[PDB]
C-alpha cells in the first residue's frame, strides 16, 4: 500500500507514535517519506547482506528474520515479510522497540540526514488529526 501523507499521519497517531519517546508525529511521517516514499512494500538490500523492509525500512540483521541474514538477532520477533503488510501495526510496534534502544530516531539514516533539525510539523500540516 502507498499511503497518503495525512492518511499515514492518522494511522501512526492511532498506533501511539505521536510524541512516543518525545518524537512528535511529524518526525515519524518525515522518516517514512524519505525511507520508503510511504510504500509499505519497499525493500532495499545492503552491502552486508541485510535487507531493509517496509514503510520504516527496518533492518533484517537486528530486528526481523528474513531467513537469509546470517547472525540475525530478530529482536522484534517477526518475519520481515510481516513488515510489508498494508496494516502498519507490525512496523509500528517494532519501530517502538528500535527508538527505545538508546539512539532514538538516529537509527534511521534518512531521518538523521533529512528530517532532524527541520520543521517536521510541516509533514502533518493540513491534516485532520
Ligand atoms: Cl510534528
Ligand atoms: Cl531520544
What would you note in describing this structure?
This protein has 129 residues and is mainly α. It has a single domain, classed as Lysozyme, CATH 1.10.530. It is 30% helix and 6% strand. The chain is built from four helices and three strands. Residues 21, 104 line the site of one chloride ion. One chloride ion binds at residues 24-26, 120-121, 124. Its EC number is 3.2.1.17. Its main location: secreted.
Radius of gyration over C-alpha positions, nearest whole angstrom:
14 Å
Helix content: 25-40%
Whole-Å distance between the termini?
21 Å
Strand percentage lies at 5-15%
Main pleated-sheet profile: 3 strands, antiparallel
Spatially, the strands of the biggest sheet line up as: 1-2-3
Number of strands: 3
- CATH fold category name: Lysozyme
* Order of SSEs: HHEEEHH
Derived structural class: mainly alpha
Total count of helical runs of at least 4 residues: 4
Q: Per CATH, which architecture? A: Orthogonal Bundle
Q: How many structural domains does the protein architecture include?
A: 1
Distinct small molecules bound, one entry per kind: chloride ion
The gross shape turns out to be globular
CATH class: Mainly Alpha
Oligomer: monomer
Amino acid at each position: 500500500k502507498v499511503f497518503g501523507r495525512c492518511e499515514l499521519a492518522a494511522a501512526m497517531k492511532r498506533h501511539g507514535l505521536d510524541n512516543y519517546r518525545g518524537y512528535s508525529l511529524g518526525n515519524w511521517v518525515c522518516a517514512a517519506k524519505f525511507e520508503s516514499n510511504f510504500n509499505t512494500q519497499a525493500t532495499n538490500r545492503n552491502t552486508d547482506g541485510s535487507t531493509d523492509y517496509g514503510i520504516l525500512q527496518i533492518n533484517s540483521r537486528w530486528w526481523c528474520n528474513d531467513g537469509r541474514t546470517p547472525g540475525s538477532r530478530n529482536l522484534c520477533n517477526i518475519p520481515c515479510s510481516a513488515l510489508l503488510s498494508s496494516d502498519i501495526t507490525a512496523s509500528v510496534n517494532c519501530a517502538k522497540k528500535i527508538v527505545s534502544d538508546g539512539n532514538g530516531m538516529n537509527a534511521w539514516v534518512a531521518w538523521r540526514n533529512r528530517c532532524k533539525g527541520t520543521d517536521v510539523q510541516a509533514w502533518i500540516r493540513g491534516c485532520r488529526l
